[PDB]
Amino acid sequence: PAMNSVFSGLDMLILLPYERRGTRLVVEDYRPDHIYCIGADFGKNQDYSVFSVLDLDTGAIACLERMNGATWSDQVARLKALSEDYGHAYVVADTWGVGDAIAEELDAQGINYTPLPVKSSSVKEQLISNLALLMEKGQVAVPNDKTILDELRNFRYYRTASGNQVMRAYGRGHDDIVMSLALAYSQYE
């Protein structure tokens, strides 16, 4: 890790085997005695959308779905299917700047969701610090997928011109997986 790495506890991250089924990485199938939620961010244009299914009873990711180039309606339909697959798991959705169509469609399609708009650096910092703390404590368990691990590894601290802290991917990288995981783990006690 570089000096400015956010996830200093990456050594305590539990790595899980999985089966790749198209856009899903499936660690385990639905356990009906457990309660699940899904962290969801939505991509515009060629950006990725990432849905992270978290078993709230074990603290482990059961399934992670990631894709780009999907229509807005297809993003919502895939989220609905994942929710239904995991017992009508509730969605923690980053609703900031998602647009009228997706907002209307979540409601119109009866998706079980709670809004968590990542509307400022302050909100992002709360989400991230919670994930990072849980990680150091050995409570975060994710699919052992190099893309996921690399995105976590490359998430770094910077400062703005006014001196405020910001967190973002190194170089010209992405953080859609990081934020999806943080949205899921925001619910974990």
Numbering used by the authors: 254 to 442
Authors' own words:
The large terminase protein is a key component of the DNA packaging machinery in tailed bacteriophages and evolutionarily related herpes viruses. Typically, in addition to an ATPase domain which powers DNA translocation, the large terminase contains a nuclease domain which cuts concatemeric DNA, generated by rolling circle replication. Crystal structures of the large terminase nuclease from the thermophilic bacteriophage G20c show that it is most similar to the RuvC family of the RNase H-like endonucleases. The overall structure adopts the RNase-H fold.
Structures for complexes with Mn2+, Mg2+, Co2+ and Ca2+ were determined by soaking crystals of the apo protein, whereas the structure of the Zn2+ complex was obtained by co-crystallization. Only one metal ion, bound to the site A, was identified for conditions containing Mg2+, Mn2+ and Co2+. This metal ion is coordinated by the side chains of D294 and D429 and four water molecules in the canonical octahedral geometry. High resolution crystal structures of complexes with different metals reveal that in the absence of DNA, only one catalytic metal ion is accommodated in the active site. Like RuvC proteins, the nuclease requires either Mn2+, Mg2+ or Co2+ ions for activity, but is inactive with Zn2+ and Ca2+. Similar to G2P and UL89, addition of Mg2+ resulted only in limited activity, leading to production of nicked or linearized DNA when supercoiled DNA was used as substrate.
